[PDB]
Protein backbone atom coordinates (compact mmCIF):
# COMPACT_ATOMS: atom_id res chain seq x y z
CA UNK A 1 0.00 0.00 0.00
CA UNK A 2 1.03 3.66 0.04
CA UNK A 3 2.78 5.04 3.07
CA UNK A 4 1.27 8.53 2.83
CA UNK A 5 -0.06 9.93 5.59
CA UNK A 6 -1.39 13.37 4.04
CA UNK A 7 -2.53 15.07 1.31
CA UNK A 8 -2.94 19.00 0.22
CA UNK A 9 -5.51 19.57 -2.91
CA UNK A 10 -7.63 22.57 -4.25
CA UNK A 11 -11.34 21.59 -4.05
CA UNK A 12 -12.89 19.45 -6.59
CA UNK A 13 -14.81 22.06 -8.84
CA UNK A 14 -18.25 20.64 -10.69
CA UNK A 15 -18.62 20.61 -14.86
CA UNK A 16 -21.90 21.62 -15.63
CA UNK A 17 -22.58 19.01 -18.93
CA UNK A 18 -26.39 18.23 -19.76
CA UNK A 19 -26.73 15.99 -16.51
CA UNK A 20 -24.20 18.04 -14.35
CA UNK A 21 -21.88 15.46 -12.76
CA UNK A 22 -20.11 16.56 -9.18
CA UNK A 23 -16.29 15.81 -8.97
CA UNK A 24 -15.46 16.14 -5.84
CA UNK A 25 -13.88 14.44 -3.00
CA UNK A 26 -16.66 12.69 -1.04
CA UNK A 27 -14.22 10.34 1.51
CA UNK A 28 -11.90 13.47 2.15
CA UNK A 29 -11.93 12.86 6.19
CA UNK A 30 -9.70 15.86 6.75
CA UNK A 31 -10.96 19.23 7.07
CA UNK A 32 -11.26 21.75 3.87
CA UNK A 33 -10.96 25.32 4.72
CA UNK A 34 -11.17 28.17 1.79
CA UNK A 35 -9.57 26.75 -1.38
CA UNK A 36 -7.66 23.73 -0.06
CA UNK A 37 -8.49 20.09 1.33
CA UNK A 38 -5.32 20.38 3.61
CA UNK A 39 -4.73 17.38 6.55
CA UNK A 40 -6.68 14.47 5.45
CA UNK A 41 -7.19 11.50 3.05
CA UNK A 42 -9.80 10.70 0.10
CA UNK A 43 -10.39 9.51 -3.54
CA UNK A 44 -6.71 9.75 -4.36
CA UNK A 45 -5.85 7.31 -1.99
CA UNK A 46 -8.35 4.62 -1.51
CA UNK A 47 -7.26 1.84 -3.65
CA UNK A 48 -10.28 2.73 -6.31
CA UNK A 49 -9.11 3.74 -9.58
CA UNK A 50 -11.49 5.26 -12.18
CA UNK A 51 -13.12 3.87 -14.61
CA UNK A 52 -12.59 4.84 -18.48
CA UNK A 53 -15.65 7.09 -18.31
CA UNK A 54 -16.14 9.61 -15.16
CA UNK A 55 -19.87 9.44 -15.49
CA UNK A 56 -20.28 5.80 -14.55
CA UNK A 57 -25.59 3.51 -6.65
CA UNK A 58 -23.96 7.15 -7.35
CA UNK A 59 -23.76 10.69 -8.55
CA UNK A 60 -22.12 10.65 -12.24
CA UNK A 61 -18.45 11.82 -11.17
CA UNK A 62 -18.19 10.06 -7.75
CA UNK A 63 -15.01 7.97 -8.46
CA UNK A 64 -13.04 11.50 -9.84
CA UNK A 65 -11.32 14.41 -8.46
CA UNK A 66 -11.46 17.40 -10.96
CA UNK A 67 -10.28 21.10 -11.70
CA UNK A 68 -11.11 23.23 -14.75
CA UNK A 69 -8.38 24.89 -16.37
CA UNK A 70 -9.60 28.38 -16.88
CA UNK A 71 -10.40 28.39 -12.62
CA UNK A 72 -6.73 28.38 -12.32
CA UNK A 73 -4.65 31.66 -13.20
CA UNK A 74 -0.80 29.80 -12.20
CA UNK A 75 -1.93 26.47 -15.24
CA UNK A 76 -1.16 24.07 -12.29
CA UNK A 77 -2.93 22.21 -9.37
CA UNK A 78 -0.73 22.50 -6.39
CA UNK A 79 -0.81 19.30 -5.08
CA UNK A 80 1.60 18.47 -1.21
CA UNK A 81 2.13 14.95 0.06
CA UNK A 82 3.27 14.30 3.49
CA UNK A 83 5.12 11.11 4.38
CA UNK A 84 5.89 9.23 7.44
CA UNK A 85 9.36 9.03 6.97
CA UNK A 86 12.18 10.25 5.34
CA UNK A 87 11.72 7.87 1.71
CA UNK A 88 13.67 7.58 -1.25
CA UNK A 89 11.16 8.20 -3.91
CA UNK A 90 11.01 6.51 -7.40
CA UNK A 91 8.66 7.52 -9.14
CA UNK A 92 4.39 8.72 -8.96
CA UNK A 93 1.82 6.48 -11.10
CA UNK A 94 -1.36 8.84 -11.21
CA UNK A 95 -4.60 7.73 -12.96
CA UNK A 96 -5.67 10.26 -15.40
CA UNK A 97 -8.98 10.70 -17.62
CA UNK A 98 -7.73 11.37 -21.14
CA UNK A 99 -11.67 12.11 -22.63
CA UNK A 100 -10.66 14.35 -25.41
CA UNK A 101 -13.81 14.59 -26.38
CA UNK A 102 -15.39 16.33 -22.13
CA UNK A 103 -12.16 18.15 -21.39
CA UNK A 104 -10.58 15.77 -19.40
CA UNK A 105 -7.15 15.75 -20.40
CA UNK A 106 -3.85 14.42 -18.56
CA UNK A 107 -1.49 16.89 -17.51
CA UNK A 108 0.94 18.65 -20.49
CA UNK A 109 4.02 18.11 -17.16
CA UNK A 110 4.72 17.21 -13.46
CA UNK A 111 7.23 19.28 -11.57
CA UNK A 112 7.84 18.25 -7.62
CA UNK A 113 9.67 19.85 -5.09
CA UNK A 114 11.53 18.05 -2.25
CA UNK A 115 11.78 18.86 1.20
CA UNK A 116 13.39 16.65 4.22
CA UNK A 117 12.46 18.46 7.30
CA UNK A 118 8.64 20.11 8.41
CA UNK A 119 10.11 23.39 9.16
CA UNK A 120 12.55 24.39 6.49
CA UNK A 121 11.61 25.58 2.71
CA UNK A 122 11.64 23.59 -0.32
CA UNK A 123 15.30 22.48 -1.24
CA UNK A 124 15.01 23.06 -4.86
CA UNK A 125 15.97 21.40 -8.26
CA UNK A 126 12.13 20.29 -9.44
CA UNK A 127 11.76 17.30 -11.42
CA UNK A 128 10.05 18.09 -14.64
CA UNK A 129 8.67 14.95 -16.98
CA UNK A 130 6.34 16.07 -19.87
CA UNK A 131 -3.10 11.65 -26.64
CA UNK A 132 -5.68 10.29 -28.92
CA UNK A 133 -6.43 7.79 -27.07
CA UNK A 134 -9.14 8.20 -24.54
CA UNK A 135 -8.46 5.52 -21.99
CA UNK A 136 -7.55 6.99 -18.69
CA UNK A 137 -3.86 5.94 -18.76
CA UNK A 138 -1.51 5.69 -15.32
CA UNK A 139 0.96 8.62 -15.96
CA UNK A 140 4.33 7.63 -14.80
CA UNK A 141 6.09 10.86 -13.39
CA UNK A 142 10.17 9.41 -12.53
CA UNK A 143 11.42 11.59 -9.42
CA UNK A 144 14.65 10.01 -9.83
CA UNK A 145 15.41 8.17 -6.25
CA UNK A 146 15.33 11.46 -4.58
CA UNK A 147 15.28 11.45 0.01
CA UNK A 148 12.52 13.16 0.34
CA UNK A 149 9.90 13.94 3.37
CA UNK A 150 7.32 16.16 1.70
CA UNK A 151 6.42 16.85 -1.56
CA UNK A 152 4.93 19.86 -3.92
CA UNK A 153 3.85 18.21 -7.23
CA UNK A 154 2.36 20.78 -9.60
CA UNK A 155 0.59 19.30 -12.22
CA UNK A 156 0.10 21.21 -15.57
CA UNK A 157 -2.52 22.19 -17.29
CA UNK A 158 -3.13 21.02 -21.22
CA UNK A 159 -6.98 20.37 -21.69
CA UNK A 160 -9.72 22.08 -20.44
CA UNK A 161 -10.14 19.63 -17.30
CA UNK A 162 -7.91 17.22 -15.00
CA UNK A 163 -9.32 14.38 -14.08
CA UNK A 164 -7.18 12.53 -11.23
CA UNK A 165 -8.53 9.66 -9.48
CA UNK A 166 -5.88 8.01 -7.90
CA UNK A 167 -2.34 8.90 -6.73
CA UNK A 168 0.40 6.28 -5.59
CA UNK A 169 4.00 6.35 -4.94
CA UNK A 170 6.91 3.87 -5.27
CA UNK A 171 9.33 4.27 -2.09
CA UNK A 172 11.76 2.81 0.07
CA UNK A 173 11.79 3.87 3.44
CA UNK A 174 16.05 5.23 4.18
CA UNK A 175 17.80 4.37 7.63
CA UNK B 1 -17.63 36.04 13.96
CA UNK B 2 -15.28 36.78 11.25
CA UNK B 3 -14.44 40.68 10.28
CA UNK B 4 -12.02 42.24 7.71
CA UNK B 5 -11.45 45.83 9.16
CA UNK B 6 -8.69 48.20 7.07
CA UNK B 7 -7.12 50.81 8.21
CA UNK B 8 -7.47 53.75 5.73
CA UNK B 9 -9.43 56.33 4.82
CA UNK B 10 -6.65 59.00 4.58
CA UNK B 11 -6.58 61.93 2.25
CA UNK B 12 -3.44 61.95 -0.20
CA UNK B 13 -2.00 64.03 -2.43
CA UNK B 14 -1.45 63.14 -6.28
CA UNK B 15 1.99 61.43 -6.24
CA UNK B 16 2.17 60.45 -2.82
CA UNK B 17 2.06 56.44 -1.43
CA UNK B 18 -0.88 55.61 0.72
CA UNK B 19 -0.64 51.91 2.46
CA UNK B 20 -3.59 50.10 3.43
CA UNK B 21 -4.41 47.69 6.46
CA UNK B 22 -6.71 45.01 5.95
CA UNK B 23 -6.41 43.41 9.83
CA UNK B 24 -8.72 39.85 9.78
CA UNK B 25 -10.05 39.48 13.07
CA UNK B 26 -11.19 35.79 13.16
CA UNK B 27 -7.31 34.19 8.25
CA UNK B 28 -5.13 32.50 5.42
CA UNK B 29 -7.58 32.58 2.35
CA UNK B 30 -6.87 33.79 -0.95
CA UNK B 31 -7.18 37.58 -0.38
CA UNK B 32 -8.04 39.90 -3.46
CA UNK B 33 -8.44 44.14 -3.35
CA UNK B 34 -11.79 45.63 -4.87
CA UNK B 35 -12.39 49.34 -5.04
CA UNK B 36 -15.21 50.98 -6.00
CA UNK B 37 -15.21 55.06 -6.60
CA UNK B 38 -18.35 56.90 -5.46
CA UNK B 39 -21.14 56.74 -8.69
CA UNK B 40 -18.99 54.11 -10.54
CA UNK B 41 -19.07 49.83 -9.96
CA UNK B 42 -16.80 47.69 -9.27
CA UNK B 43 -13.34 47.09 -10.24
CA UNK B 44 -10.89 44.33 -9.04
CA UNK B 45 -7.67 45.05 -7.96
CA UNK B 46 -5.24 42.58 -7.31
CA UNK B 47 -5.16 38.89 -5.67
CA UNK B 48 -2.81 37.22 -3.42
CA UNK B 49 -1.95 33.06 -3.56
CA UNK B 50 -1.13 32.57 -0.11
CA UNK B 51 1.92 34.79 0.60
CA UNK B 52 2.68 34.38 -2.85
CA UNK B 53 1.65 37.27 -5.40
CA UNK B 54 -0.90 36.91 -8.57
CA UNK B 55 -0.96 39.39 -11.09
CA UNK B 56 -2.58 42.88 -9.79
CA UNK B 57 -4.28 44.39 -13.37
CA UNK B 58 -3.91 45.65 -16.56
CA UNK B 59 -3.92 49.54 -14.57
CA UNK B 60 -2.69 48.45 -11.96
CA UNK B 61 0.81 46.65 -13.33
CA UNK B 62 2.73 49.56 -12.14
CA UNK B 63 2.88 50.01 -8.77
CA UNK B 64 0.21 48.44 -6.33
CA UNK B 65 2.02 46.18 -4.03
CA UNK B 66 0.16 43.36 -2.27
CA UNK B 67 2.27 42.64 0.81
CA UNK B 68 0.98 40.03 3.95
CA UNK B 69 1.75 39.78 7.09
CA UNK B 70 0.86 36.53 8.79
CA UNK B 71 2.59 37.81 12.24
CA UNK B 72 0.05 40.61 12.62
CA UNK B 73 -2.83 38.88 10.01
CA UNK B 74 -2.71 42.09 8.10
CA UNK B 75 -2.85 42.10 4.03
CA UNK B 76 -0.85 44.95 3.24
CA UNK B 77 -1.37 47.91 0.36
CA UNK B 78 1.33 49.89 -0.66
CA UNK B 79 -0.29 51.82 -3.62
CA UNK B 80 3.05 54.17 -4.65
CA UNK B 81 2.23 56.53 -7.50
CA UNK B 82 -1.02 58.05 -7.30
CA UNK B 83 -3.21 60.49 -9.97
CA UNK B 84 -6.40 62.25 -8.64
CA UNK B 85 -8.69 59.68 -10.54
CA UNK B 86 -7.55 57.05 -8.35
CA UNK B 87 -10.03 58.27 -5.56
CA UNK B 88 -12.66 55.33 -4.50
CA UNK B 89 -13.96 53.13 -1.19
CA UNK B 90 -11.31 49.77 -0.96
CA UNK B 91 -12.44 46.76 0.29
CA UNK B 92 -11.02 43.55 0.62
CA UNK B 93 -12.07 40.54 -0.37
CA UNK B 94 -11.55 37.15 1.03
CA UNK B 95 -12.68 34.29 -1.59
CA UNK B 96 -13.90 31.20 -0.47
CA UNK B 97 -15.55 28.27 -2.01
CA UNK B 98 -19.34 27.68 -2.85
CA UNK B 99 -20.64 23.89 -2.39
CA UNK B 100 -19.71 22.97 -5.81
CA UNK B 101 -15.83 23.62 -5.37
CA UNK B 102 -15.94 27.10 -7.53
CA UNK B 103 -14.84 30.24 -6.17
CA UNK B 104 -16.21 33.44 -5.01
CA UNK B 105 -15.93 35.76 -1.96
CA UNK B 106 -18.05 35.24 0.61
CA UNK B 107 -17.08 38.17 2.98
CA UNK B 108 -16.56 41.64 2.32
CA UNK B 109 -14.60 44.40 4.18
CA UNK B 110 -15.99 47.26 5.67
CA UNK B 111 -14.55 49.73 2.96
CA UNK B 112 -12.19 53.29 3.16
CA UNK B 113 -12.47 56.55 1.39
CA UNK B 114 -9.44 57.50 0.17
CA UNK B 115 -9.10 60.93 -1.29
CA UNK B 116 -6.61 62.17 -3.91
CA UNK B 117 -6.77 65.75 -4.34
CA UNK B 118 -4.12 68.49 -3.67
CA UNK C 1 -9.95 40.00 -19.46
CA UNK C 2 -13.35 42.27 -19.78
CA UNK C 3 -16.75 41.58 -17.99
CA UNK C 4 -19.20 43.45 -19.87
CA UNK C 5 -22.74 43.23 -18.07
CA UNK C 6 -25.45 44.60 -20.00
CA UNK C 7 -28.06 46.31 -20.13
CA UNK C 8 -26.30 48.96 -17.31
CA UNK C 9 -30.54 49.57 -15.54
CA UNK C 10 -33.40 47.13 -15.65
CA UNK C 11 -37.08 48.96 -15.01
CA UNK C 12 -39.16 46.52 -13.68
CA UNK C 13 -42.01 45.97 -10.68
CA UNK C 14 -42.37 43.73 -7.69
CA UNK C 15 -43.08 40.32 -9.11
CA UNK C 16 -41.43 40.69 -12.92
CA UNK C 17 -39.45 38.12 -14.43
CA UNK C 18 -36.14 39.36 -14.48
CA UNK C 19 -32.70 38.28 -16.25
CA UNK C 20 -29.99 40.03 -16.49
CA UNK C 21 -26.93 38.86 -18.71
CA UNK C 22 -23.27 39.05 -18.68
CA UNK C 23 -20.73 38.74 -21.22
CA UNK C 24 -17.06 37.58 -21.16
CA UNK C 25 -14.44 38.84 -23.95
CA UNK C 26 -13.25 34.80 -24.09
CA UNK C 27 -14.79 31.83 -24.17
CA UNK C 28 -13.97 31.17 -20.17
CA UNK C 29 -14.86 28.07 -17.82
CA UNK C 30 -18.24 27.60 -16.01
CA UNK C 31 -16.98 29.87 -12.88
CA UNK C 32 -19.02 33.06 -12.28
CA UNK C 33 -20.15 35.28 -9.52
CA UNK C 34 -23.50 37.32 -8.81
CA UNK C 35 -22.98 40.23 -6.07
CA UNK C 36 -26.25 41.80 -4.82
CA UNK C 37 -25.06 45.08 -3.38
CA UNK C 38 -27.59 47.79 -2.39
CA UNK C 39 -26.75 51.76 -2.20
CA UNK C 40 -24.02 52.98 0.83
CA UNK C 41 -23.64 48.82 1.53
CA UNK C 42 -20.87 46.10 1.23
CA UNK C 43 -21.82 43.53 -1.89
CA UNK C 44 -23.71 40.40 -1.03
CA UNK C 45 -22.64 36.88 -2.63
CA UNK C 46 -25.69 35.21 -4.23
CA UNK C 47 -24.28 32.71 -6.75
CA UNK C 48 -20.89 31.07 -7.16
CA UNK C 49 -19.99 28.49 -9.91
CA UNK C 50 -23.33 29.35 -12.00
CA UNK C 51 -26.28 27.22 -10.96
CA UNK C 52 -24.93 27.46 -6.91
CA UNK C 53 -26.89 29.60 -4.72
CA UNK C 54 -25.29 31.16 -2.20
CA UNK C 55 -26.66 30.00 2.02
CA UNK C 56 -29.57 32.66 3.32
CA UNK C 57 -30.19 33.80 -0.45
CA UNK C 58 -33.61 32.81 -1.85
CA UNK C 59 -34.25 29.98 -4.32
CA UNK C 60 -35.78 32.93 -6.50
CA UNK C 61 -32.59 33.94 -7.45
CA UNK C 62 -31.68 30.77 -10.72
CA UNK C 63 -28.20 31.16 -12.64
CA UNK C 64 -27.37 30.19 -16.04
CA UNK C 65 -24.74 30.04 -19.13
CA UNK C 66 -21.66 28.90 -19.80
CA UNK C 67 -18.34 29.92 -22.26
CA UNK C 68 -19.05 33.67 -22.93
CA UNK C 69 -23.28 34.19 -22.57
CA UNK C 70 -24.51 34.24 -18.87
CA UNK C 71 -27.91 34.98 -16.96
CA UNK C 72 -29.53 35.65 -13.80
CA UNK C 73 -32.89 35.32 -14.04
CA UNK C 74 -35.55 35.78 -10.78
CA UNK C 75 -38.53 33.92 -10.60
CA UNK C 76 -40.40 36.45 -8.49
CA UNK C 77 -38.79 40.46 -8.41
CA UNK C 78 -39.31 41.14 -4.51
CA UNK C 79 -39.19 44.34 -2.59
CA UNK C 80 -35.47 43.55 -0.95
CA UNK C 81 -34.60 43.01 -4.63
CA UNK C 82 -33.70 46.12 -5.91
CA UNK C 83 -30.11 47.04 -6.09
CA UNK C 84 -26.88 47.24 -8.43
CA UNK C 85 -25.69 43.17 -9.46
CA UNK C 86 -22.03 42.39 -10.53
CA UNK C 87 -21.31 39.50 -12.46
CA UNK C 88 -17.08 38.46 -11.75
CA UNK C 89 -15.04 35.92 -13.21
CA UNK C 90 -13.51 34.96 -10.41
CA UNK C 91 -10.31 32.03 -10.44
CA UNK C 92 -8.05 31.33 -8.12
CA UNK C 93 -6.08 34.43 -9.39
CA UNK C 94 -6.88 36.49 -11.69
CA UNK C 95 -10.29 37.74 -11.76
CA UNK C 96 -12.16 40.64 -13.31
CA UNK C 97 -15.02 42.21 -12.28
CA UNK C 98 -18.40 43.55 -14.15
CA UNK C 99 -19.94 46.28 -15.19
CA UNK C 100 -22.91 46.17 -13.04
CA UNK C 101 -27.10 46.37 -13.70
CA UNK C 102 -28.73 48.20 -11.74
CA UNK C 103 -32.29 47.38 -10.74
CA UNK C 104 -35.05 49.58 -10.42
CA UNK C 105 -38.49 50.25 -9.01
CA UNK C 106 -40.99 50.44 -11.93
CA UNK C 107 -43.83 53.17 -10.62
Known amino acids: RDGLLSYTAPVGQTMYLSEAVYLNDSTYDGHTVGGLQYGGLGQLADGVVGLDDFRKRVWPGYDYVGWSNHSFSSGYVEMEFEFDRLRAFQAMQVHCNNMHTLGARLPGGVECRFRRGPAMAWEGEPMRHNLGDPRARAVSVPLGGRVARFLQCRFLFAGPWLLFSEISFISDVVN | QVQLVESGGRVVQPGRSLRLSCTAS?????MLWVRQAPGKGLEWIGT???????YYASWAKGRFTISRDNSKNTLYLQMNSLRAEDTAVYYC???????????????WGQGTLVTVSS | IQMTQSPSSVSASVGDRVTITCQAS??????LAWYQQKPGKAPKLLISGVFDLASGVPSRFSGSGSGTDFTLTISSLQPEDFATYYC?????????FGGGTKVEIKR
Open chain 3, 88 to 96: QYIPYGSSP
Open chain 3, 26 to 31: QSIGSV
Open chain 2, 93 to 107: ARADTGDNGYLGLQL
Open chain 2, 26 to 30: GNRYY
Open chain 2, 48 to 54: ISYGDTT
